Amino acid sequence: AAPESFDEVYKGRRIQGRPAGYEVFVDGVQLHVMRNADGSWISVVSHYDPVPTPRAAARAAVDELQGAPLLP
Amino acid sequence: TVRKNQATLTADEKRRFVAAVLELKRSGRYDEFVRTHNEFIMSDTDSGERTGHRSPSFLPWHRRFLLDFEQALQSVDSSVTLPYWDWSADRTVRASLWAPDFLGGTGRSTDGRVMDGPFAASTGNWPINVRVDSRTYLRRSLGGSVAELPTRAEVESVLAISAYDLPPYNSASEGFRNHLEGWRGVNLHNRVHVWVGGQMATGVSPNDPVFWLHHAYVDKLWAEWQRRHPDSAYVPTGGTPDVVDLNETMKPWNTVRPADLLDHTAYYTFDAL
C-alpha cells in the first residue's frame, strides 16, 4: 500500500501528496519524488538525503526552495 | 591522460580547466550533460530499470559519463584533463578547491548564492538553465546540511568490502557499490552531495562544476578497490532483470558495457593509485 494522501500549507506553500506510485505537488506544480527500498523518500529538489515520508519530502523541498516557484 | 588531484594543479592548469568548462557552458554543451544526468537520476528506481545510480552500473556508467565530459573538455583545450577532489583529505571550506581562483566558495546565508569564483552568477558566465525551480544562480551551503565529509578511515572501511555488489542490486544492497554510493553504511558519495548543498544536493547536481571532481574521486576509489580485491569483480554476470549485467550495454550510449569500463588504464591513469 502507498502512503496516505495529504494536503497542508507549509511555510506559506500548499503541499499535496496522493497515490497515483505517488505524486507530490508544491503550489500545484508536480514535484518528482521517489521511494527507496527501505521505505524512505527523496525528491528532485533533495535527492541524496532520504526522509521518512512523502510529506517529509515535500517539506524538505519547500525548505530548499526558499520561496522559489517550482518548475514543471 | 593523467587525472590529477585538484589540490596539486598549478595555477595555469586551474586556469585552463576553468576556461574549458566555461566554454562548454557558453556553447550549450555543458547543459546537456546536466540534462542527461537528471534523466537517469529521475528514471532509475529500486524496483525497476536502473542504470546510472542505485545499481551496480553506478560506477561504470559514471566512468563513461566522466570520459564523455573529459573528451568534451579536451575538444576545447587538449591539455586539460579532469581533476579529482579527495574529500577525505581536502575537507574544509578553507581548502584551495573553494578559492576564488578555482571553484569559488560557499553560498551567502540568505539565498545560498555563490558570490565569488568563476561560476558566480554575477559574472554572467554561469547561468543555471537545466533546473527544477525559478532560481538561475549557482548555490552552495558547504557543511550546512551534514557535519562532516567522509574521512580516510571511513573510505578505507568501504574499500575493505570484498563483494562488488549483491542482490537485490539496489539501494538496499550490502557490498562495495552501495556503501561507496552511500545508501547504506557510513555514507560516502551521497553525503558529499549533501555536504556541498545547493544544486549538488538536487537532481540537477552537475550544475556545479565540483560534480565532476567529486565523481572523479569516486571513480578513483573504484580503481583502488579493484587493486585491493584482484579476485573480486563486477556483478551481476547475466540474467538479471532491470539491472545492467557485466556484458550488457548501457544507456544512453548503448555501445559500451560495464565490461568495457572495468580497466580504467585503457583511458587514463591516476597521479597515484
Domain ranges of chain A: 5-66
B133–chain A nearest CA distance, Å: 4
> Given its phi and psi angles, is residue B73 left (phi above 0), alpha (psi -120 to 50 degrees) or beta?
alpha
- Way it was determined: X-ray
**Alpha-carbon gap, residue B138 to B17, rounded angstroms:** 18
Q: Reported resolution in A?
A: 1.2
Geometric angle at alpha carbon B145, from B204 and B40, rounded to 5°: 25
> Given its phi and psi angles, is residue B97 left (phi above 0), alpha (psi -120 to 50 degrees) or beta?
alpha
Q: How many CB atoms lie within 10 A of CB B208?
A: 28
Q: Which of B119, A47, B189 shows the shortest CA–CA distance to A64? A: A47
**Are B41 and A47 inside 8 Å of each other by CB?**
yes
Domain, as residue range, for B23: 1-273
CB B173 within 8 A of CB B54: no
C-to-N gaps above 2.5 Å in chain A, after residues = 20
Q: Which fold has domain A5-66?
A: protein ne1242 fold (3.30.1880)
Task: Specify the 3-state DSSP secondary structure of A7.
Answer: strand
Provide the residue count of chain A.
72
Mutation target vs A (from B133, B134, B194, B210; most A CBs, 10 A cutoff): B133
**Are A44 and B42 inside 8 Å of each other by CB?**
yes
Provide the residue count of chain B.
273
**Are B190 and A48 inside 8 Å of each other by CB?**
yes
Radius of gyration of chain B (CA): 18
With a CB cutoff of 8 Å and minimum separation 6, the contacts of B135 are A68, B111, B128
Question: Which residues from chain B sit within 8 angstroms of residue A46, using beta carbons?
Answer: 201-202
CATH number of domain containing B265: 1.10.1280.10
Query: Chain B window 213-272: which residues touch A at a Cβ cutoff of 8 Å?
Result: none
Share of chain A residues as helix, strand and coil, in percent rounded to the nearest 5: 15, 40, 45
Question: Which residues from chain A sit within 8 angstroms of residue B204, using beta carbons?
Answer: 44
Q: How many CB atoms lie within 10 A of CB B259?
A: 16
Q: Which of B233, B217, B232, B56 shows the shortest CA–CA distance to B150? A: B217
Q: Which secondary-structure segment (H or E) carries B175?
A: none
Number of domains in chain B: 1
**Alpha-carbon gap, residue B248 to B57, rounded angstroms:** 10
Among B38, B172, B191, the residue with its CB nearest the CB of A37 is: B172
Q: Which of B251, B213, B218 shows the shortest CA–CA distance to B49? A: B251
**Alpha-carbon gap, residue B181 to A48, rounded angstroms:** 10
